[PDB]
Each structure stands twice: as C-alpha cells, then as structure tokens.
C-alpha cells in the first residue's frame, strides 16, 4: 500500500523536473542565469512554513527541496552545455512568469503533501528497496533523456 | 502492487494538464477544440502501438477515446470561463513546438502504463482500487473541479465494470 506513496512522490518529482527544460529555454533565450539565490531561499522558507503546517519535519522537507533545487539546476546546466555544443531549441520558450512558474508553484504544495505520506515510512528498513523499485518502474514507462533521469536520482537521493 | 494503477492515474493527469495550454493556444488562434482528422490519426497510431506492446487494440483505443473526451471537456470548460471574463494573461505556449511534443511523449508512456494495468481489467476489485488511486491523487494535486471531473472521464473505461 505504501508502495503507492513512493510511486506518487516519484511521479511528482519527475513532473517538476520536466519543467526544467522550459525554464532553461526561457533563460537561454533571454540570457538570464540559472542560479537565482533570492528565489531559491524564498522557496525554502515557504517549504519550511508549509512543512510545519502539514506536520512534516521541516529539516526533512528543506533537505528534500534542496535536492529538488539541485536536480533542477543540474538538468538546466546540462541543457545549456548541449545547446552550446550544437544549437538552442527551435521555437519560442513558454513565458517563465505566466506559464512555467505557476506550474512549479503548484508542485511545491503537491510535493509537500506527497512527502507527508512518505515521511512515516522514511526510517523503515525496506524504504530504499521499495523506492528503487518505484524509480525503475517509472523510468521504464516515461523513458526520458539520460540527463533528466540523472537529475531524478539527485531529486530522490534523501527520501530515505 | 497497486502501483500500476497509481502510475496510470499520474500520467493521465499529466496529459490532461496539457489541455490548458492547448486551450490557451486555441483561444488566441480561434482554432476549434474538436479536430476530427488529428484525433482519428492519434487513435490509429494508438492501435498500432498497442499491438507492439501486447495491449488489446480496442482497449487502448477506447482508453484514448476517453483521453480525447477528457481533454475537450476541460478545454470547453476553460473557454466557458474565459468567455465570462477574459482569457489568460500572457502568451500561449506554442502548440507545435512546446505543447504537442509533450502530448506525443505521453502516448507511449500511457500505452506502456495501460499494459501494466491490463491484467486487472476484469478483476473484481479493480473499480474500487482505481477509485482509491484517483482520490489519493486528487488530494495531492488539487486541480480545479473542471479538471478533476475530466480526470474521471479519462479513467472511465480502465476497469471492465
């Protein structure tokens, strides 16, 4: 049963990671930096607020979202290197402010709630085994590019 | 485990969420929500991919009939909302280079996800397990009622009953 809680956490982490490409696309075109320290710190404060409210350990949640932030930057920088080595993506980027950013904000709430269901299981002996099974079951469905699959590991590296 | 259903719900919801940028693009460009030749092409492709993946072609086709119905339901609900006030602020994501590639990837993920759900299609407790996954997911993501209603449409022929 708790397998589904891990499964949902994996799915929502992948979903948030998929928005890294349109972020990177928008920054690539507009020449804005991948690093945005005041926006990251604002996300981590909001995470601590929502965590405490939903009865989640804030340290657990801050760390998990450290990894969400780190996985996102990892994928964005890999896309920049690919685009430097060849060419940027054809077509305009979705508007960061009105299209992409609202989808990222919705996922903060979703991930907090998903994490609250996983949090009781976090110390269980079979947590890592069941998580790795959920991760492999997801990857064989969606079959994303290797750079995205790579950052998914970072995103989920402190669940257990 | 019930992870097969859980993954199916998540991907169906992911595909349904792309109906907003489809609707937004069509609202600016005044293109009709219904696109018979594009739909029929999609369902033809779904039947051919299902065979490759060992899924019953009619089961996959019906499931994608429901994905289309759910998308159009949501898009019409967004149009009704935008008519009452105004459309969205901000430009629409490009349908051809931004939204449709995401939709196309989900075709293969959904077909593979459906293949894992197939052995449960006639299981006596399939409907309640599905309904449980849907409710679990809705309480996580908290989309508007139009989208949540359309997600029910999208998953309405997963179980035989």
- For chain A, how many helices (H) and strands (E)? 7, 0
Q: Which of A141, A143, A149 to mutate to test the interface with B (most CBs of B within 10 A)?
A: A141
Q: How many helices (H) and strands (E) does chain B have?
A: 7, 0
- Sign of the dihedral through C-alpha A76, A77, A82, A84: positive
Per-residue DSSP letter, A86: S
E strand or H helix at B39: helix B36-52
DSSP state of B46: H
Resolution in A for the shown PDB structure? 2.2
Which DSSP helix (H) or strand (E) runs through B76?
Answer: helix B57-84
Tokens of A159: 């669940």
- Give the long-range contacts of residues B118-126, CB within 8 A, separation 24 or more: B118/B55, B118/B56, B118/B59, B120/B4, B120/B5, B120/B159, B121/B59, B121/B158, B121/B159, B121/B160, B122/B159, B122/B160, B123/B159, B126/B158, B126/B159, B126/B160, B126/B161
d(CA B42, CA B36): 10
Give the three-class secondary structure for A73.
helix
Query: B87 and chain A: CB distance < 8 Å anywhere?
Result: no
Would you state the structure tokens that stand for residue A133, as one six-digit string?
Answer: 């099974």
CA distance B29 to chain A (A): 16
A148: closest CA among A22, A47, A41, A3?
A: A22
- A134 and B3 within 8 Å at the Cβ level: the answer is yes
Residues of A in contact with B3 (CB under 8 A): 3-4, 7, 134, 137
List of domains in chain B: 1-161 (1.20.59.10)
- Sequence-distant contacts of B28-34: CB under 8 A, at least 24 apart: B28/B87, B28/B91, B28/B92, B29/B92, B33/B72, B33/B75, B33/B76, B33/B79, B34/B72
DSSP for A87-104 reads -PPSSPPPPIIIIIHHHH
For A88, A89, B75, the CA distances from A30, given in Å and listed in that order, are: 12, 13, 31
**Which tokens hold the place of B97?**
């280079």
User: Which chain A residue is nearest to residue B101, measuring alpha carbons?
Assistant: A91
Contacts 24+ apart (CB under 8 A), B50-59: B50/B111, B50/B114, B53/B111, B53/B112, B53/B115, B54/B115, B55/B111, B55/B114, B55/B115, B55/B118, B56/B118, B59/B114, B59/B118, B59/B121
Instruction: Find the residue in B nearest to A139 (Cα).
Output: B109
- Residue B94 and residue A99: Cβ atoms within 8 Å? no
Task: Confirm if B43 and B65 have CB atoms less than 8 A apart.
Answer: yes
Experimental method: X-ray
Please check whether residue A96 touches B, CB under 8 A. Answer: no
Is B3 in contact with A4 (Cβ distance < 8 A)? Answer: yes
Q: Which of A94, A144, A149 to mutate to test the interface with B (most CBs of B within 10 A)?
A: A94
A8 touches chain B (CB under 8 A): yes
């Amino acid at each position: 049963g708790d397998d589904t809680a891990l499964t949902n956490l994996v799915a929502l982490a992948s979903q948030r990671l998929a928005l890294a490409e349109p972020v990177a696309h928008w920054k690539w075109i507009n020449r804005k930096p991948i690093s945005d320290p005041p926006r990251e710190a604002a996300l981590l404060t909001d995470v601590e607020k929502r965590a405490t409210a939903n009865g989640v350990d804030p340290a657990y949640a801050r760390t998990f979202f450290d990894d969400q932030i780190a996985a996102s930057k990892q994928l964005q920088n890999a896309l920049f290197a690919t685009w430097r080595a060849t060419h940027g993506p054809e077509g305009p980027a979705p508007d960061l402010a009105t299209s992409t950013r609202p989808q990222l904000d919705r996922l903060t709430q979703s991930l907090i709630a998903a994490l609250a269901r996983v949090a009781p299981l976090r110390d269980a002996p079979d947590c890592p085994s069941r998580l790795a099974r959920s991760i492999a079951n997801w990857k064989t469905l969606t079959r994303y590019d290797s750079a995205q699959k790579d950052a998914l590991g970072t995103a989920l590296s402190h669940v257990c």
